[PDB]
Design a binder for this molecule. Sequence first.
Ligand SMILES: O=C(O)C1=C[C@@H](OP(=O)(O)O)[C@@H](O)[C@H](O)C1
Length: 424
Amino acid sequence: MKTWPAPTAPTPVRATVTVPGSKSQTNRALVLAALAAAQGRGASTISGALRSRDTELMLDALQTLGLRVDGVGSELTVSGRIEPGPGARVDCGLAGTVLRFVPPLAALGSVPVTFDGDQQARGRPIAPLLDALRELGVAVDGTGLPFRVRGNGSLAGGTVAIDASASSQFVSGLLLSAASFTDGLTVQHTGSSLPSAPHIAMTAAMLRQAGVDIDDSTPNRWQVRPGPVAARRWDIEPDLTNAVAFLSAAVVSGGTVRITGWPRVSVQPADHILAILRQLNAVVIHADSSLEVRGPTGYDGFDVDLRAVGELTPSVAALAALASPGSVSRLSGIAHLRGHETDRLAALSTEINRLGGTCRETPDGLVITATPLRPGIWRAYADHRMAMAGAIIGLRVAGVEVDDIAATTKTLPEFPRLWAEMVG
Ligand SMILES: O=C(O)C1=C[C@@H](OP(=O)(O)O)[C@@H](O)[C@H](O)C1
């Protein structure tokens, strides 16, 4: 595979960028549309849907379960029933949302469904959710990929306790289908350290838009009452995590990037994101239904807690590597990133140090000292966000090439073109 050379920015980037739909919201919408359709409420359409490997895996997973998903562009229509064929096998790829959100959904069917995924997906956490499904009555063969969910057309629900410290998607995955369990569900996260609170809140918010009653008034506990899931039209926001890769270009070059269609009120953690950018003295404004970010002339080291927004770590690590020389930055709260697409703390450490940088993995994150960097091959680990972090570095370091920019197809198949258009 040819490498992809990351274009440099010898002068401030200036651009208006449109990023496609949110992966997290798209895949929640597809699951909820499938439940409504499986419940006999009719077809649903998702407008502005992300088309990427993770959402194609999700819609193929629903089709494996018997549903129909139509649409060649960003408008997807879900219909039909859960009625899996003999030997049904969901391919999870490297999509945690498919791996975690579809096995509950599938216990509603009356035929078992096998789950498999990429070799690299088999190293990602999944066993706690399968134990929880077993506690709720579902027969599950296997404690890791490949595993089979042997449903008998129904799932009684009830109360269940789970350690979800390794992934909020263990909670989201159970919450999304719980309205179709006979008794609904009460889910209790045991212990502490629950990452990605905004993605669980995302789940709860979209469940309420589908008419589902969910009580999240007590931390670490969620009660969902049994009831209908409405068929409705979903409007998908731009992916704000992907937007940060482009906004970072403004930050490191002292330029100006605008993102179109930014929601002033979002189901995504927009407030965390904008606060972080302002930590680096970026000027952030909302204008013309767009978000504008103007980078500072330079920035020093920063400390940032990424527990609630860990998927920002690759881009934020790149920003830290590009701070003024001798700056020290501390990224914390992200032990769980050892279980992501790749171990992102080891990978970021490895690739930054290869460019001559200074990145030290810590038990919950990274400490990065900004030092002059040099050309190299920034290696993707099949991880869309590692790939875009390489692009960010390359803005300020000539001679940086990403081995596998096509890794970006996970959530942004058009990255290479959009990025070229931005940097110009
Ligand atoms: O539910 C979601 O859509 C996701 C939740 C988070 O997972 P973890 O809590 O496992 O990090 C996030 O990092 C992931 O990229 C998307």
